[PDB]
Design a protein around this ligand. Structure first.
Ligand SMILES: O=C[C@H](O)[C@@H](O)[C@H](O)[C@H](O)CO
Ligand SMILES: O=C[C@H](O)[C@@H](O)[C@H](O)[C@H](O)CO
Ligand SMILES: O=C[C@H](O)[C@@H](O)[C@H](O)[C@H](O)CO
Ligand SMILES: O=C[C@H](O)[C@@H](O)[C@H](O)[C@H](O)CO
Ligand code: NI
Ligand code: NI
Ligand code: NI
Ligand code: NI
Ligand code: NI
Ligand code: NI
Ligand code: NI
Ligand code: NI
Ligand code: NI
Ligand code: NI
Ligand code: NI
Ligand code: NI
Lengths: 388, 388, 388, 388
């Protein structure tokens, strides 16, 4: 019947999302700034579970130690009054002109040292607020031209930075983990660790890999034309999906950050299906931008649509899996065999198995249809609620 | 003056490249098949170092043990007469209809067992011929629809397969290593391990990671809009660039496999620059298709252009790096600082360093230009041979 | 409740669609060839309205005049027995090696003359069978390299060819019109008249523009990352949508030709909405390929899914428009004002209108939200059948 | 030897190019604003021919009639002192929040009337300054969601607007023409008239088509993965290339606006080749953004690189065409035949010509290679200055 979200659904929003003033490359802001406290109250009314923030969203850049203290106190009371949580925090290493060539991988060494200190300062605040995950989006790490950045040295600097933060966390005894958010491009011509895969590979080279995971975003992988649910499957397979950014994107172009459900709808369905069947227990975080055509009423409707869409898809995906006709179709397509080991009998046995080569009837096997189209139409019917 | 390749340049070609008959999705072959022996002699005349092959290129599918023996003997004499080497070999797990849903990750278990036996048989042949690398391109591993393939189970099957081959190699005492070739899509809607990053991450989950590397292809990463030289830098950083496939691609669309140099020319320049300065010593393998508009004279001209283009770029990249004006520009852009550790002084020292935050003048740092445009124009001048 | 198609729905299929044997760039056929007569009977059973064909699908290439006559007679009886119609026909100017550099724009003049004769021969057959539209897809018209094709001369040849066919039709007194099908690339590196826009512009340069329209395909425009429904709106605006090819595509990559409904689902919804509200009365033609993983049962299920998906979307789009809440939302977003002339009062009046500039309150106007997000969520609810 | 530009080369720059302060979606300005007068003097020193402007670049928005007059006088003296010309002008209908849903196609009628008045006011100024072309880039014309914009009505409003401007120009007796600049997306999710083709088609529906042309931009067509030189060939073929925007773009992603020469280098070569051989006599306008990593010295170096790159390519393209070996290769590939009419003998003659079908030897024709690869390698050698 209806689709009301409750804090139990674990839906979270960055302050910078509903707070996006509408400034784009070709235009000025179309909305006034939101007081983070108003955003907390409004999201709470909508059924959200918590909020996330960059240091600079909560405490204006260059704020003194006193002003800083007041901003946090104000934010803290709003949280106490609403029951909202703060499961994730991050650093802004992309807005200020000093980070024009990056933070952790800036060619200027002094800039790199500054970026680390700025991050460390915010990690202490994040722990103070109860955040369990600390996200790192290296938006300025990259280049527009080939000779500007030696990638191998840049990767040495990136590893050095992450190892230092890991040494810091472990020395303060914090119970906080890191999640690297990949993005292929924008604002840099090409960004380092462009996809979930590159991020996962890099993590295996850190001194304490256990502390690092990935924070994939729907639109980012889609900006590279990749299959998001497949990338998420691989991150789960590796045990590295620490957090997730949900939104929508219409193909390969600029990062749109539409509300979740918009963009590639079928991909959204397969994503929810995967997260739910895999038992993902982390937050369902929306990193979206309510389009600039909207006024404040439009932003809250956009935020509500994020949660609504997730809930509808969850219903349809659940109905899909529980359908006996679908369970039969899955067996018809041999999904059950895919889950069985190819050779639990071992190498030697396989080599001696004449049924696996010498006596294998390749034409008989080749003639078997996979029945994938029937299966996919069942999935389509379920998504559209068209199952008679 | 001129650009003649010699076997010392380590240029290699797959038999399937100059041998591509021109069959495409919408058209029939425009060229007769080439006898692998003729291809060996022709490539040798052109200055190539060696050739590579899929089992099915050398020995027709379904060949008896006797015919098989004759085909190899014939091929062996051609190699002896020309001095050509065979540094890499691979398996064809994509053409025959039996592999329509994959080889190692086919839902059908019997198909998966067959794919392993077929690969093992060819590994023995590869070692016999002296190949040091065995490439694996899972072209049929993937899907067109969401419910057809459970990616986590598929990744379990992929790992199982690679671990078994690793157990085989180590048991026969072979001195051969594996290289996984990624591709984002085509012929499947989405292919598993779509980019160099995903492949590198997966490798870290194998039982014997030391035996596996990556075989990236210029056009494949470009089909995802990614920066190829950056991906190669990361593979080198990880010590996993075991082999490389060179060709050209005009952006995001079907896999064109144009001759090397064609497609994104500037990317080709930065690639050669990187491979040469990094001391890549493996083969410079061309996996290209001479367009179907060509007759045989056109195919040999296309193959020659591959090597010619590599040699010209190598000259221009060498001239770029050795230019004192460029060395000065590199210092102006702080590439030297990027190579210096951010905090060799350690964590505690960084936290106590007031020059890294408290007394850091952010406006002064922000005002410094990176001088990247001057550097890039110097690179452009060098590429075009326009340095006065 | 259910979604059964009937010939009244005007659903048509090319013989080459359900008949696609599964041959792709990296693989052999996975299905035997279908007798066109069997395809006619099977599609009729499924509720289809008619079929379409290339000359070479019906009459094997190189067939004598007698064999040709028999093939047509056989096909004719199948049509008579089923009541199926043939509303569109086309020429195959892409498969045979002679068309490797094109048909109408081949550099070889003799080839260009041959292509015209081949098309003319099939136009006579099309009229004989009752086809009202003749489609032209210049799949081989284009290039892989810059100097191979002088585009201005190629466009002169393209216009010459179309003008000649127009002169032929008008001289035989045929009641048949032409529809040019655009495609950005594949099989050529870049194809001439790459999008609906380029095709529409070209048509305005023909001697008898009235005889030519466009035959857009969902996936083709999406291979250029364009909004298909927007392109269709422009073709309707110009009065040039003579026919349409329906299928699915997952973004920018090779031409997938998935069944309709698959690919970008939301785009499919907006397309059906537009065609139905605009009163498009031509055929709903599916130019799709049942994936090669399927056997014959899978191909017929895929074809049925094409029609089913169109019918479901038509229902949801109709429900969307007829919803009073949606009609109210449309007024809230000023869609009614968009339909009103900006200045029916004329130029002079506008220049003298102080309310249009001098006394225009720009801040007041800027503050009005467009309410687009609320509208889009209503559309999402309707698509998913989630309207309470 | 060297490549110095002189005003005779007709190189022009928009004030907004070298003046771009570096503000992007994720960052603040990294450069102070430039006084348009300083930009005029600086560009003049670099060898530029003239500058272009949006109304809002020259006269701050909301300026009184007096301030307006002073700004123009100041700008006028700078032009007189340098000898710089102003060949093109345009309107800013994208920055101010009032244009959030468009200017000419905004759903709000009052906004549409305001946009026309604002444009008309600037047309008078453009003529006053001597501009021969008036560009219109409908950056805000489009949508993020399907129901927000009825495209057919939007196209009615777009035509109404352009017809009114045409009526205005013709009534004032101005000798100024319009050029529509297409762009597929950004800042809107999808922009109306997304490519050169769509723009050309639309123009044929205006009341006075003679007054309208197109202003294509390198990067814009490349954001749709299209071949820019091919699009330019079609615009020239139609006699509609009134102006051109030159820059660089690295594939399908956000609009980078790199300096000319950067991005797809080979495409830049083929573009210059075409413009020069076609005798394009309009300005060579650069619409680029010096990357934000740069300080002012870097912006002037970037602007100089634009002109330098154009001059180098012009040299290489000229050398390519004048090479007798290339002229021979062109004949070998039948470019001379492409330029010959297919059937100047007429329709009836073609139908009676047995050599065009009945007696046409298709196998003989099919066997002829096009020799395109040899031709393309000659072009590569010339571009790289590697012709021995
Ligand atoms: O496009 C950029 C990212 O998606 C951005 O929102 C990061 O997620 C954020 O800075 C970390 O919380
Ligand atoms: O597009 C596919 C690949 O590039 C293919 O050529 C593989 O490289 C080959 O099968 C391994 O040698
Ligand atoms: O991708 C190519 C086209 O879509 C093709 O199927 C044409 O439509 C056909 O040849 C005309 O009927
Ligand atoms: O990306 C947008 C355009 O390229 C822009 O610069 C227009 O050209 C300009 O507003 C007209 O002069
Ligand atoms: Ni993002
Ligand atoms: Ni994003
Ligand atoms: Ni994010
Ligand atoms: Ni490849
Ligand atoms: Ni390839
Ligand atoms: Ni390859
Ligand atoms: Ni098609
Ligand atoms: Ni298609
Ligand atoms: Ni089609
Ligand atoms: Ni632009
Ligand atoms: Ni641009
Ligand atoms: Ni422009």
């Amino acid at each position: 019947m209806n689709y009301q979200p409750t804090p139990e659904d674990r839906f979270t929003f960055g302050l910078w999302t509903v707070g996006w003033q509408g400034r784009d490359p070709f235009g000025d802001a179309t909305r006034r700034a939101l007081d983070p406290v108003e955003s907390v109250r409004r999201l709470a009314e909508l059924g959200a579970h918590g909020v996330t923030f960059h240091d600079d969203d909560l405490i204006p850049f260059g704020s003194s130690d006193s002003e800083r203290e007041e901003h946090v106190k104000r934010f803290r009371q709003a949280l106490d009054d609403t029951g909202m949580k703060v499961p994730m925090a991050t650093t802004n290493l992309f807005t200020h002109p000093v980070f024009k060539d990056g933070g952790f991988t800036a060619n200027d060494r002094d800039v790199r040292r500054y970026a680390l200190r700025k991050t460390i300062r915010n990690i202490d605040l994040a722990v103070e607020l109860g955040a369990e995950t600390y996200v790192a989006w290296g938006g300025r790490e990259g280049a527009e031209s080939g000779g500007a950045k030696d990638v191998r040295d840049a990767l040495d600097r990136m590893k050095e930075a992450f190892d230092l933060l890991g040494e810091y966390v472990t020395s303060q005894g914090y119970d906080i983990r890191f999640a690297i958010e990949p993005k292929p491009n924008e604002p840099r011509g090409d960004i380092l660790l462009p996809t979930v895969g590159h991020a996962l590979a890099f993590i295996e080279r850190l001194e304490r890999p256990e502390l690092y995971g990935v924070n994939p975003e729907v639109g980012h992988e889609q900006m590279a034309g990749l299959n998001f649910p497949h990338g998420i499957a691989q991150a789960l397979w590796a045990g590295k999906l620490f957090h997730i950014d949900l939104n929508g994107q219409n193909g390969i172009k600029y990062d749109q950050d539409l509300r979740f459900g918009a963009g590639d709808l079928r991909a959204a369905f397969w994503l929810v299906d995967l997260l739910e069947s895999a038992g993902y227990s982390g937050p369902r975080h929306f990193d979206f931008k309510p389009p600039r055509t909207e006024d404040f009423d439009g932003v809250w409707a956009s935020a509500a649509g994020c949660m609504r869409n997730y809930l509808i898809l969850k219903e349809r995906a659940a109905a899909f899996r529980a359908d006996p006709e679908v369970q039969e179709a899955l067996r018809a397509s041999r999904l059950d065999e895919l889950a069985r080991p190819t050779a639990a009998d071992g190498l030697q046995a396989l080599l001696d198995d004449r049924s696996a080569f010498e006596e294998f009837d390749v034409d008989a096997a080749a003639a078997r249809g996979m029945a994938f189209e029937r299966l996919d139409q069942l999935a389509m019917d379920h998504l559209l609620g068209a199952r008679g």
